[PDB]
Amino acid sequence: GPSRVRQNFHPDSEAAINRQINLELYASYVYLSMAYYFSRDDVALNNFSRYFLHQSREETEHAEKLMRLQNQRGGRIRLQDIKKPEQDDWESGLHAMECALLLEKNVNQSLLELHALASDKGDPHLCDFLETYYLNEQVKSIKELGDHVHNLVKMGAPDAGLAEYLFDTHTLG
Amino acid sequence: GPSRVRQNFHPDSEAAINRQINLELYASYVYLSMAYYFSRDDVALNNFSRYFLHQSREETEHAEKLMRLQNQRGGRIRLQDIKKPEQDDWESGLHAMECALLLEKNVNQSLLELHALASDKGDPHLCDFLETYYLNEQVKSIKELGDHVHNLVKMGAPDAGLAEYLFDTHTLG
Amino acid sequence: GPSRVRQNFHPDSEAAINRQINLELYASYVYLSMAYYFSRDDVALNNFSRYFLHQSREETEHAEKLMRLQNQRGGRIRLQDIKKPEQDDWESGLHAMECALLLEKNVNQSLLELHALASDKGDPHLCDFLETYYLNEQVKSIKELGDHVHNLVKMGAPDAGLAEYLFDTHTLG
Amino acid sequence: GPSRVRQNFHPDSEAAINRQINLELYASYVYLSMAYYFSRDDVALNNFSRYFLHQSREETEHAEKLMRLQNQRGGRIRLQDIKKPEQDDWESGLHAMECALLLEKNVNQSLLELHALASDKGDPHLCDFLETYYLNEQVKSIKELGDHVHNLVKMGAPDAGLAEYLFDTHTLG
Amino acid sequence: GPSRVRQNFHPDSEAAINRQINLELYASYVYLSMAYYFSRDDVALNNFSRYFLHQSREETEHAEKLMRLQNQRGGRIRLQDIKKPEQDDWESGLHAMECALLLEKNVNQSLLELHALASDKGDPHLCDFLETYYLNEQVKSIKELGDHVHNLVKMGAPDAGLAEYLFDTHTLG
Amino acid sequence: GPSRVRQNFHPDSEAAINRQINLELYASYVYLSMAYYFSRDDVALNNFSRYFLHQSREETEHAEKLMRLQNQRGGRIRLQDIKKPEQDDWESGLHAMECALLLEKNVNQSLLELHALASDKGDPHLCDFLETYYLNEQVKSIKELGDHVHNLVKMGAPDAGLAEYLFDTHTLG
Ligand SMILES: [Cl-]
Ligand SMILES: [Cl-]
Ligand SMILES: [Cl-]
Ligand SMILES: [Cl-]
Ligand SMILES: [Cl-]
Ligand SMILES: [Cl-]
Ligand SMILES: [Cl-]
Ligand SMILES: [Cl-]
Ligand SMILES: [Cl-]
Ligand SMILES: [Cl-]
Ligand SMILES: [Cl-]
Ligand SMILES: [Cl-]
Ligand SMILES: [Cl-]
Ligand SMILES: [Cl-]
Ligand SMILES: [Cl-]
Ligand SMILES: [Cl-]
Ligand SMILES: [Cl-]
Ligand SMILES: [Cl-]
Ligand SMILES: [Cl-]
Ligand SMILES: [Cl-]
Ligand SMILES: [Cl-]
Ligand SMILES: [Cl-]
Ligand SMILES: [Cl-]
Ligand SMILES: [Cl-]
Ligand SMILES: [Cl-]
Ligand SMILES: [Cl-]
Ligand SMILES: [Cl-]
Ligand SMILES: [Cl-]
Ligand SMILES: [Cl-]
Ligand SMILES: [Cl-]
Ligand SMILES: [Cl-]
Ligand SMILES: [Cl-]
Ligand SMILES: [Cl-]
Ligand SMILES: [Cl-]
Ligand SMILES: [Cl-]
Ligand SMILES: [Cl-]
Ligand SMILES: [Cl-]
Ligand SMILES: [Cl-]
Ligand SMILES: [Cl-]
Ligand SMILES: [Cl-]
Ligand SMILES: [Cl-]
Ligand SMILES: [Cl-]
Ligand SMILES: [Cl-]
Ligand SMILES: [Cl-]
Ligand SMILES: [Cl-]
Ligand SMILES: [Cl-]
Ligand SMILES: [Cl-]
Ligand SMILES: [Cl-]
Ligand SMILES: [Cl-]
Ligand SMILES: [Cl-]
Ligand SMILES: [Cl-]
Ligand SMILES: [Cl-]
Ligand SMILES: [Cl-]
Ligand SMILES: [Cl-]
Ligand SMILES: [Cl-]
Ligand SMILES: [Cl-]
Ligand SMILES: [Cl-]
Ligand SMILES: [Cl-]
Ligand SMILES: [Cl-]
Ligand SMILES: [Cl-]
Ligand SMILES: [Cl-]
Ligand SMILES: [Cl-]
Ligand SMILES: [Cl-]
Ligand SMILES: [Cl-]
Ligand SMILES: [Cl-]
Ligand SMILES: [Cl-]
Ligand SMILES: [Fe+2]
Ligand SMILES: [Fe+2]
Ligand SMILES: [Fe+2]
Ligand SMILES: [Fe+2]
Ligand SMILES: [Fe+2]
Ligand SMILES: [Fe+2]
Ligand SMILES: [Fe+2]
Ligand SMILES: [Fe+2]
Ligand SMILES: [Fe+2]
Ligand SMILES: [Fe+2]
Ligand SMILES: [Fe+2]
Ligand SMILES: [Fe+2]
Ligand SMILES: [Fe+2]
Ligand SMILES: [Fe+2]
Ligand SMILES: [Fe+2]
Ligand SMILES: [Fe+2]
Ligand SMILES: [Fe+2]
Ligand SMILES: [Fe+2]
Ligand SMILES: [Fe+2]
Ligand SMILES: [Fe+2]
Ligand SMILES: [Fe+2]
Ligand SMILES: [Fe+2]
Ligand SMILES: [Fe+2]
Ligand SMILES: [Fe+2]
Ligand SMILES: [Fe+2]
Ligand SMILES: [Fe+2]
Ligand SMILES: [Fe+2]
Ligand SMILES: [Fe+2]
Ligand SMILES: [Mg+2]
Ligand SMILES: [Mg+2]
Ligand SMILES: [Mg+2]
Ligand SMILES: [Mg+2]
Ligand SMILES: [Mg+2]
Ligand SMILES: [Mg+2]
């Protein structure tokens, strides 16, 4: 139009928000895949399943809050295909946790690049939005996954027969 | 393996369930797109938005129950890309309702084909699963959307200035 | 003195905060004027009246929080005349909403300039204050007013006899 | 028009009500200024601050009830600039109380002149409105401020170091 | 390692966080010293004591939240000696309040330097952490202490026999 | 002065109480260090962390009760630097427990020496104070830590992958 609401909102920021929406939906899909891997009859770690299903739902919330931001600022949402996750078989509780940690660091790098763009475009509203709802959530998620990876490694996962079972019961229960 | 749980579960049924999972996730994504279209500053039909967001969440439930079925029967979930919806701009409340009706009939045709396959493979568990959780839900959804389309058409949508506003307040409120 | 509390608080920031206090009080006065326009016997849109009276009270809160900030940082409040609003007769519900939208964008531009000044003066406390209490409130207000303008335009306001009446009852009720 | 509601409402009364609205808003602004003076780091009399903030809010109520009267009688509200208060620095608790007392007597004189005009124009509704909501409130406010001035003078304000502190705690607490 | 969690976290920021932890613990110790000065038999200002004990506990919280941040970001906490406070005898309620005000401004300068470093290193997570939990808390603490100093000075502390006693009862009670 | 409260309170006892205050604060700091070691991403034993944070807070209470005693008896508190703990990296749950046990025995030896001094100076109030609040608390703490060390040793800590994890969940949970 521009939109009668649009103010101080650079087209590059609008485009970067659309790419972030897609990445959050991708993260949601990765976690959904992991959740149902852990409910296979030959895996059957029900608290790993619950943990990743919860993470999946949180990532859909992350996507939705960026879709809301786009509308609030007068941008136009442009959805793209949600790519399937990299693996069909997540191999073990430890491997899934390590893949989740890498995913969260990759999404964090994307958010830091978006914050740098918002700063370059003099968009303090977008900077604050990312700082308030994304950057600390990402740090907390990365730390939690790092904690989980460390315990599973120390316990002897994936080959130590009791490790993932006990972690499933005692940490994720 | 086969899976130590697998019994009377044809590979074609397993593959058809994976395709249905993808279609339900696609339907979820279409509805998510519609929900955020209706919260644009130049659309602002908040109960259309709420209605389609609810439909989106129900379709993710539909996908998840098929993912659970795959695991229960000892099949292996194989996820694929979730294609973006056909439209970025859903044009009007009436157009979105008509597109939703067509989507629901297309998903119903897929479910009827899956039921015919399950029947051909002598899989009464899969037949009952579809009849119990999918086929009546689809008939109810198609009827509700048809009701909504009829009222919006009769009221003069999309060009009659009061029609979508009043429908948003009085039916979807 | 300087004030025994003052630290990292530039005189230009102090002056810009005094100008912002005046602008928030002006916005409060505009909304008060609009509120009582809608309770005229020849307008009588009581929910438009309530809506703008609420917006008036929120703007006085906005002014007061900046007056508090000035004292917290050791600046000195310098009040100026609160100019009367631009119009005595706001013409219609749609016209008042469009004028409110323009007011909110003008106040937002002032807040963005204040944030740029605070950034230039290395005042992260003032930057955070604006981001936490002003910039997202402004984006939400601009979006809400844009939504309202769109519905009133589509409904045929101001000339369509039912439009402002129905909007008053169903959105602002 | 005249307004289809207007009856026995002289144009001079309508104009005098508009001037009274402005004076009540001015009184509100004076009290707001005083409230934030008392929360300066070098004044810090928090119950003086609370007292004057309350008086400020009451004066805005006084303005609003006259704006309502104008609409009820079919007059047209005509707002004017709200002049800034006379002082930026209110010097002491005693000085602020003495200035408030003078303000209230000046506003009372304006209300008595308005009542005399209403009487001259044979407007018993306007006479009763002023008697019911303004004249006794003004007498009570003037008496309360006189009480406060007397105690502060007797206690040795502003130079007696304990006087304003103790009055703030024990009377305004 | 680096830590499998570490991302966008500069070694200089890690070191500056360790120095800030020490400074917050120092502030805690200063306040603890002041608290027990006020419970001496020859001072016996129990609400000054309570006030400073509370401030001591808040500073330990400030230290702990930075220790948590270090772990969240994958830095390594490096503790140093907590230096004893500057004075054994805090002389008076007024002198302790003035020393606390200077301490809070010195800690604020350290936090502003840390924020400038975080900005220089492109660490928006660390910038937001400081803005969210430290910079406004510091401004509020400095303002409260300035208020307290002003009242005690005006009341005639420390030599006016009633001043600190009355302030202890009426402000800090 | 002496203090108008001082009675039967030897200067050597006063000095020994000041040294004990410092030692209790040191113990508090050791435990604080241990608490945050266990929340590292590469340790992540959250109940070890909670356990040592609680012990840290108890030691600050121990310091404060001696500071209160000094004031009650008319002595003068003389604070000294709180030395940093001996280790930055506590190596394992078992090593931290063994270091805590040694710390508690060293603090107990200090308390026994203080009791012997109080006895030598004919100070039954100080003897009773130590017996009532310190000596049994120390015996209980040493016994609890010995219990914890024994279980961790028997379970195969630190090298047995499940030992510290299971102890964290089942004893410290
Ligand atoms: Cl723009
Ligand atoms: Cl994309
Ligand atoms: Cl794509
Ligand atoms: Cl590709
Ligand atoms: Cl970007
Ligand atoms: Cl950045
Ligand atoms: Cl910016
Ligand atoms: Cl966050
Ligand atoms: Cl963990
Ligand atoms: Cl590890
Ligand atoms: Cl094992
Ligand atoms: Cl089979
Ligand atoms: Cl597919
Ligand atoms: Cl595909
Ligand atoms: Cl294609
Ligand atoms: Cl099929
Ligand atoms: Cl069939
Ligand atoms: Cl069958
Ligand atoms: Cl069904
Ligand atoms: Cl319908
Ligand atoms: Cl029809
Ligand atoms: Cl119509
Ligand atoms: Cl300054
Ligand atoms: Cl101004
Ligand atoms: Cl002016
Ligand atoms: Cl002018
Ligand atoms: Cl500016
Ligand atoms: Cl800026
Ligand atoms: Cl800055
Ligand atoms: Cl905000
Ligand atoms: Cl609306
Ligand atoms: Cl429009
Ligand atoms: Cl109409
Ligand atoms: Cl008339
Ligand atoms: Cl006037
Ligand atoms: Cl004027
Ligand atoms: Cl003038
Ligand atoms: Cl008059
Ligand atoms: Cl009269
Ligand atoms: Cl009369
Ligand atoms: Cl009255
Ligand atoms: Cl009085
Ligand atoms: Cl008098
Ligand atoms: Cl006095
Ligand atoms: Cl890094
Ligand atoms: Cl240090
Ligand atoms: Cl040192
Ligand atoms: Cl030194
Ligand atoms: Cl620094
Ligand atoms: Cl900075
Ligand atoms: Cl940055
Ligand atoms: Cl803060
Ligand atoms: Cl104070
Ligand atoms: Cl002063
Ligand atoms: Cl005195
Ligand atoms: Cl003695
Ligand atoms: Cl010592
Ligand atoms: Cl030392
Ligand atoms: Cl040494
Ligand atoms: Cl000893
Ligand atoms: Cl002994
Ligand atoms: Cl004895
Ligand atoms: Cl004991
Ligand atoms: Cl044990
Ligand atoms: Cl043993
Ligand atoms: Cl083991
Ligand atoms: Fe999460
Ligand atoms: Fe959650
Ligand atoms: Fe996310
Ligand atoms: Fe995430
Ligand atoms: Fe267990
Ligand atoms: Fe539905
Ligand atoms: Fe539902
Ligand atoms: Fe479905
Ligand atoms: Fe459906
Ligand atoms: Fe609002
Ligand atoms: Fe509100
Ligand atoms: Fe505002
Ligand atoms: Fe506003
Ligand atoms: Fe910032
Ligand atoms: Fe009053
Ligand atoms: Fe009142
Ligand atoms: Fe008044
Ligand atoms: Fe008044
Ligand atoms: Fe009193
Ligand atoms: Fe505090
Ligand atoms: Fe507190
Ligand atoms: Fe602090
Ligand atoms: Fe502080
Ligand atoms: Fe922020
Ligand atoms: Fe203990
Ligand atoms: Fe305890
Ligand atoms: Fe102890
Ligand atoms: Fe101990
Ligand atoms: Mg564009
Ligand atoms: Mg992408
Ligand atoms: Mg499950
Ligand atoms: Mg592909
Ligand atoms: Mg495996
Ligand atoms: Mg936050």
Ligand SMILES: [Mg+2]
């Ligand atoms: Mg196969």
Ligand SMILES: [Mg+2]
């Ligand atoms: Mg398909």
Ligand SMILES: [Mg+2]
């Ligand atoms: Mg909505």
Ligand SMILES: [Mg+2]
């Ligand atoms: Mg395509």
Ligand SMILES: [Mg+2]
């Ligand atoms: Mg259209």
Ligand SMILES: [Mg+2]
């Ligand atoms: Mg049924």
Ligand SMILES: [Mg+2]
């Ligand atoms: Mg100046």
Ligand SMILES: [Mg+2]
């Ligand atoms: Mg201005």
Ligand SMILES: [Mg+2]
């Ligand atoms: Mg009304």
Ligand SMILES: [Mg+2]
């Ligand atoms: Mg003018």
Ligand SMILES: [Mg+2]
């Ligand atoms: Mg008109």
Ligand SMILES: [Mg+2]
């Ligand atoms: Mg916010």
Ligand SMILES: [Mg+2]
């Ligand atoms: Mg006229």
Ligand SMILES: [Mg+2]
């Ligand atoms: Mg006047």
Ligand SMILES: [Mg+2]
């Ligand atoms: Mg106050």
Ligand SMILES: [Mg+2]
């Ligand atoms: Mg003037």
